[PDB]
Design a protein around this nucleic acid. Structure first.
Ligand SMILES: [Mg+2]
Length: 520
DNA sequence: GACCACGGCGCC
DNA sequence: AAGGCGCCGTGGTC
């Protein structure tokens, strides 16, 4: 089938990177397949200019690499997206190939022919799946182009500020470490939970409460240590040591070393086929779990800044999952609460209760994750459902359907297969139930945010603004100072009106020089 | 160098 | 708020 480069327009592309991150990868090889032919590019970088779109497996990644090189090469069809819609457990090329009629190799030509062949089969599987096709055409496929922009754009980071902060935190860690070592009566590796275990529960003879899941060792987690916060001063130091080292090792130290030499910015990856619910994920590095709660966490978030002459615009959906719950269940009362613009919670304290049913929390975990009366905690949970009968009925209906079909679905029909709903082991069955009825909620919220990104992106391009980050129910944009206000106002409207529900969606928006101040 | 499992923990 | 994730250091292996 081998023919000379270039391929005819519309061909399926195959490509090989030196490493998984497209912003950092060397393009080792490039090929394309179509009409019973395969075309291999003599020089991949040059040949990249001959393509009009990236059609094939991992299309977005190639598109990002093209953007890095200053080329406009939007991602198109991608068999990975079709398979992910069919079954969100389809997360890798390896598995999708083996499942739908091929083998994922390390040769571009074969990857091109594979892309073509797999697209043929998958597109066949999606016939009759009207709603899955809608998600593909209206959400996933167009979203892939938005994600490519975000990845290639990156976000600015105050490196010098983080470098200075590292030295400050290092000294405080030293202070905690030396103190812990004194109390232990000896020095040990504080980073080793095994060594720590022995020191706390054997040597210091402190009470061992819970056990680890897989190996049944005596846990040293924060939930456990919290309880011993008064039973020994060493516990206090250990918990402070944990926060500082976690944030230093995970964010403060690594991030500055990841600045791209061409862009001068930090670039993450937004993985589009990585979760069981339809959410995006972020990696290399993960920019969806940057610290925000503690004082030191806030210091770190301040390092994410706007380019000179620009401002960050931060938009957050308010309680989107609860609003989705109101819609899906059709519960009159819950719906009323939002319609009348009242704070559902008043309708961390009583909030744990309201945000509690979204995953069926343990009535016992209410006296712990909220410190209540325990026995009396499992007594108010009935009133919750007494006032929201349609919610219980919805949960019940969801599970019943999940058992019969073998899957649950979001408002738009995104599916997740949950096979353990009839497991004969209680703990397993019940864990499965929690996954099952959470996904229509978390998944619908993901569908909505994705659709909002798809609608918003073209509007931002028109205004010379950029989309930088998504954090599940949040967006961070970057706009020129003279257009920031207009951008903020427009984005809010797009997000709030993405897909009208039985209840309004509300969005909080802020503008600032950095990620933290942009909220306040 | 590389991979993995685990406990642990950061965010939504 | 913390079902859904990704990264850390440790500990073990090849
Ligand atoms: Mg794990």
């Amino acid at each position: 089938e081998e023919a000379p480069w270039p391929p005819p327009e519309g061909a399926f592309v195959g490509f090989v990177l030196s490493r998984k991150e497209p912003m950092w990868a060397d393009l080792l090889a490039l090929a394309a397949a179509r009409g019973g032919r395969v075309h291999r590019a003599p020089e991949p970088y040059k040949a990249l200019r001959d393509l009009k779109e990236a059609r094939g497996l991992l299309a977005k990644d190639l598109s990002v690499l093209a953007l890095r090189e200053g080329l406009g090469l939007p991602p198109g069809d991608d068999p990975m997206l079709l398979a992910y819609l069919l079954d969100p457990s389809n997360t890798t090329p390896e598995g999708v190939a083996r499942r739908y009629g091929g083998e994922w190799t390390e040769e571009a030509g074969e990857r091109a022919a594979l892309s073509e062949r797999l697209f043929a089969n998958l597109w066949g599987r999606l016939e009759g799946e009207e709603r899955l096709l809608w998600l593909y055409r209206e959400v996933e496929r167009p979203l892939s182009a938005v994600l490519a922009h975000m990845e290639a754009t990156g976000v600015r980071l105050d490196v010098a500020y983080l470098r200075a902060l590292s030295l400050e935190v290092a000294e405080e860690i030293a202070r905690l470490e030396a103190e812990v070592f004194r109390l232990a009566g000896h020095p040990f590796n504080l980073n080793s939970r095994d060594q720590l275990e022995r020191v706390l529960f054997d040597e210091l003879g402190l009470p061992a409460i819970g056990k680890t899941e897989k190996t049944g060792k005596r846990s040293t987690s924060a939930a456990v240590l919290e309880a011993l916060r008064e039973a020994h001063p060493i516990v206090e130091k250990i918990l402070q040591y944990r926060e500082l080292t976690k944030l230093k090792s995970t964010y403060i130290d690594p991030l500055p070393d990841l600045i791209h030499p061409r862009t001068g910015r930090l670039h993450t990856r937004f993985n589009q086929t990585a979760t069981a619910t339809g959410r995006l994920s972020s990696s290399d590095p993960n920019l969806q779990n940057i610290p925000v709660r503690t004082p030191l966490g806030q210091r770190i978030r301040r390092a994410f800044i706007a380019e000179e002459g620009w401002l960050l615009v931060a938009l957050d959906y308010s309680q989107i999952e609860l609003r989705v719950l109101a819609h899906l269940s059709g519960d009159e009362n819950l719906i009323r609460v939002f319609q009348e613009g009242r704070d559902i919670h008043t309708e961390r304290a009583a909030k744990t209760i309201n945000f509690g049913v979204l995953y069926g929390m343990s009535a016992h975990r209410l006296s712990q994750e909220l410190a209540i009366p325990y026995e009396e905690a499992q007594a108010f949970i009935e009133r919750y459902f007494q006032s929201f009968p349609k919610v219980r009925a919805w949960i019940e209906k969801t599970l019943e359907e999940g058992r019969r079909r073998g899957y649950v679905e979001t408002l738009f029909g995104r599916r997740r297969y949950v096979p353990d709903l009839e497991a004969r082991v209680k703990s397993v069955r019940e864990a499965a139930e929690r996954m099952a009825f959470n996904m229509p909620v978390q998944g619908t919220a993901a569908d909505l945010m994705k659709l909002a990104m798809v609608k918003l992106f073209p509007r931002l391009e028109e205004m010379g603004a950029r989309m930088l980050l998504q954090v599940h129910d949040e967006l961070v944009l970057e706009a020129p100072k003279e257009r920031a206000e207009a951008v903020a106002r427009l984005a809010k409207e797009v997000m709030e009106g993405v897909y009208p529900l039985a209840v309004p969606l509300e969005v909080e928006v802020g503008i600032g020089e950095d990620w933290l101040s942009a909220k306040e």
